[PDB]
Design a protein around this ligand. Structure first.
Ligand code: FES
Ligand SMILES: [Mg+2]
Lengths: 49, 215, 26, 100, 14, 225, 44, 135
């Protein structure tokens, strides 16, 4: 089974700024999507599931 | 390794359950301490008595109080407090007095490192109230240095064995006041009738001052 | 001391209390 | 000769306004959710006003508008409460757009 | 100091 | 032999100066006043432990004394800069969703950490189980909002004290500063106030990290020769 | 308060009775003691 | 070994004491910084208590002398049809312009209140200001 890599180095500092959420990958994705929705505002089916 | 653990209470608690009727679990109260002022207590709960011992003793080590000791043998001043319905009155005592206290207090005092103290427990004698009531009172005791700093005066100890020699035990780190502490001709302090009745020889008990093993 | 400090007084913007339609009438 | 806080407070427009009830203020739309316009008008809390039916498309992010203020912060104390419940928004009525 | 039985074997884990 | 000089020239030297990072140049009572930091909640929402930090009530709206905020903010920024200098882990926490995106970006930009999402029970008090026995917890937690969405204290305020973590926190007039190590009375609602705080902390943290690199680099060049 | 209970910890929470809230809800969640009150009073 | 008794003292006192007792082998990274630059108040848990009887908060209402002039101006002339611009830190409303003129005329020695208010309205009308009496 795919194994998550270490989430910190030797000094103990986590690599990702959302480490302490416990869901850094999920919240990093929500953070990226929420940011895109904002930039659009500043600027302004059958075959897929 | 520096910490010792002592059991204070082992109880069988019986829970009525929707489908399984009366079930039996264990509630344990244990105290931990290193004998140098650091001590704590924790409750442990489990179906087995030995799992409760592990939970209580391991949890207590993360809830340690620090207790200040006068000359590393007694408390800094007389402590009288009530926790819920349990009253605990503790008296500062000189070296060689030993621990003349409730057996549970004796156990806890050896973990904290207090060698000489008198304590009297009144009202409800509930082990849990006594334990946390004891730790609350011992953790809120003002040391002599704090008294000197708070009042900006010298703390001078008068010992009858040393006669009239004044022994300064604490001096304020900040400036030293020049105005003497007001001398109220009569203090408005509340007194304990048990303490007063003893000093007046009117306290008669066959159980007081009995010969007991070294504690 | 300082001229811009607040001054103690009664609320100058306070509104009058409400009155019933018959307040002040026999 | 450094201005003190007491001086800043005395001469601030928000202090000089007095009570906020029935006061006309200029706001700025900074966030829009469907037909809900979030308008900042210089106070602690923004107000939320529904897009007017007439000239609704003129109200966009950054559009400056005229408001009639009612309360700077909507708060009320409910029975059995030790403190006040606040909705964290001001109460204001949207009148229209400000133009030069 | 005294002995309490050891709680579990660490290998009994993922 | 060489470690004591390292810790003395790098770790102990900054602690001998009143403002080693010059964080007083980052703000002024006027700059705070323009960001509406003095605006507090209504008197009916006032917490009694916030009365020391309140200038008064202007028509039932509490005003925060910016003279105190300036002194408290100086202490909070100085502590935060020193912890960044020492390479401490700084975690920003806030549940105000109006500023979740802003705060998360400020953390990433300064090289620190943000937790603006739902705070799960035991993130700090049970971190070894949730993350692993070798997990390193934060050395400093900075609250831009100390209350959760139901107007109660953020659980991390209590849990930070349990784990002996110092806390910096913006405390509005309805907040409880008792357990916050370095409280900073200020408006936590206005976008201008929150944006200001993020600039100050981001700048204080970034300056301290560059100062740490400068000193280390100088200490090495001089060491060889 | 009265015999009618008002001790709810989240008394300051903003009541949001909408169709979208029902979909974004924990399936485990069950109605609290004073949760029916708002429904009984909103229907009135 | 540590202490999670967040209601017993402060993180500094609890950490300082356990360091002395030898319970904590090393000081935490923040301890030396706290020692050098401590907060104004030591962070000790306190339980907020409710006031009863004759106990009242010391917070005082913020008032100024000119507020009396503002209350009368709003009563007599109402709020100006001009809109407040609270973004401009130097904005001056019709009331503030009235207050400044009222203050100037008072410094010229006039002391009557009803007379000092009528002369102020005339001065502004001469300057072109619109003052529509509410009633
Ligand atoms: S309000 Fe009814 S008599 Fe005055
Ligand atoms: Mg606030």
């Amino acid at each position: 089974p795919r194994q998550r890599a270490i989430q910190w180095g030797e000094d103990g500092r986590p690599f990702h700024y959302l480490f302490y959420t416990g869901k850094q990958s999920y919240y990093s994705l929500m953070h990226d999507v929420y940011g895109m929705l904002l930039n659009l505002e500043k600027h302004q089916v059958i075959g897929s599931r | 390794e520096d910490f010792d653990t002592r059991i204070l209470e082992v109880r069988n608690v019986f829970t009525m359950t929707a489908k399984e009727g009366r079930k039996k679990s264990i509630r344990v109260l244990v105290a931990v301490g290193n004998g140098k002022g650091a001590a704590g207590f924790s409750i442990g709960k489990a179906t087995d008595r030995m799992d409760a011992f592990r939970k209580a003793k391991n949890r207590a080590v993360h809830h340690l109080h620090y207790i200040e000791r006068y000359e590393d043998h007694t408390i800094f001043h007389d402590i009288s407090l009530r926790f819920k319905r349990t009253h605990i009155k503790m008296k500062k005592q000189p070296k060689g007095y030993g621990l003349r206290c409730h057996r549970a207090i004796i156990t806890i005092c050896r973990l904290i490192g207090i060698k000489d103290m008198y304590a009297k427990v009144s009202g409800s004698i509930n082990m849990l109230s006594l334990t946390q009531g004891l730790f609350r009172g011992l953790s809120r005791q003002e040391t002599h240095q704090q008294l000197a700093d708070k009042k900006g005066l010298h703390v001078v100890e008068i010992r009858e064995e040393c006669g009239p020699l004044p022994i300064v035990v604490a001096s304020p780190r900040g400036p030293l006041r020049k105005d003497p502490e007001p001398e109220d001709e009569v203090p408005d302090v509340k007194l304990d009738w048990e303490d007063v009745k003893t000093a007046q020889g009117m306290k008669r008990s066959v159980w007081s001052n009995l010969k007991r093993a070294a504690t | 001391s300082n001229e811009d400090l607040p001054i103690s007084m009664e609320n100058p913007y306070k509104e009058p209390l409400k009155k019933c339609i018959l307040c002040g009438k026999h | 000769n450094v201005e003190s806080f007491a001086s800043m407070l005395r001469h601030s427009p928000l202090t000089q306004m007095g009570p906020a009830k029935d006061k006309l203020v200029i706001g700025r739309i900074f966030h829009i959710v469907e037909n809900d316009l979030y308008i900042d008008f210089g106070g602690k809390f923004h107000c939320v006003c529904r897009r007017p039916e007439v000239d609704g498309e003129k109200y966009q992010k950054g559009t400056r508008v005229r408001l009639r203020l009612l309360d700077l912060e909507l708060t009320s104390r409910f029975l059995g409460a030790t403190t006040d419940t606040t909705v964290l928004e001001a109460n204001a009525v949207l009148l229209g757009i400000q133009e030069s | 100091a005294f002995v309490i039985p050891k709680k579990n074997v660490p290998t009994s884990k993922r | 032999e060489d470690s004591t000089d390292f810790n003395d020239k790098i770790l102990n030297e900054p602690l001998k100066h009143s403002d080693f990072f010059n964080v007083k140049e980052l703000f002024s009572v006027r700059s705070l006043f323009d960001a509406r930091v003095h605006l507090g909640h209504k008197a009916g929402c006032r917490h009694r432990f916030m009365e020391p930090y309140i200038f008064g009530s202007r028509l039932d709206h509490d005003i925060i004394d910016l003279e105190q905020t300036a002194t408290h903010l100086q202490l909070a920024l100085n502590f935060t800069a020193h912890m960044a200098y020492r390479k401490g882990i700084i975690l920003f926490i806030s549940r105000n969703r109006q500023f979740s995106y802003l705060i998360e970006n400020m953390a990433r930009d300064c090289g620190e950490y943000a937790h603006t999402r739902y705070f799960r029970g035991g993130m700090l008090t049970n971190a070894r189980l949730l993350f692993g026995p070798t997990v390193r917890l934060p050395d400093l937690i900075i609250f831009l909002h100390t209350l959760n969405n139901i107007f109660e204290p953020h659980v991390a305020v209590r849990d930070a004290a349990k784990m002996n973590i110092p806390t910096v926190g913006i405390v509005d007039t309805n907040c409880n500063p008792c357990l916050i190590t370095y409280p900073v009375p200020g408006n936590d609602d206005s976008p201008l106030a929150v944006h200001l705080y993020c600039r100050l902390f981001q700048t204080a943290i970034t300056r301290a990290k560059e100062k740490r690199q400068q000193v280390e680099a100088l200490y090495r060049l001089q060491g060889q020769k | 308060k009265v015999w009618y209970e008002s001790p709810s910890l989240g008394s300051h929470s903003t009541y949001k009775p909408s169709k979208l809230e029902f979909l974004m809800r924990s399936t485990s969640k069950k109605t609290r003691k004073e949760d029916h009150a708002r429904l009984r009073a909103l229907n009135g | 070994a540590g202490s999670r008794l967040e209601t017993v003292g402060s993180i500094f006192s609890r950490t300082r004491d356990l360091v002395r007792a030898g319970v904590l082998k090393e000081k935490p990274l923040w301890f030396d910084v706290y020692d050098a630059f401590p907060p104004l108040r030591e962070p000790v848990f306190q339980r907020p208590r409710v006031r009863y009887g004759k106990a009242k908060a010391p917070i005082q209402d913020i008032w100024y002398h000119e507020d009396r002039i503002r209350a009368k101006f709003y009563s007599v002339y109402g709020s100006g049809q001009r809109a407040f611009d609270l973004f401009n830190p130097n904005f001056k409303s019709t009331c503030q312009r009235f207050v400044e003129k009222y203050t100037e005329l008072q410094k010229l020695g006039e002391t009557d209140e009803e007379k000092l208010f009528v002369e102020t309205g005339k001065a502004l009308l001469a300057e072109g200001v619109i003052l529509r009496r509410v009633g």
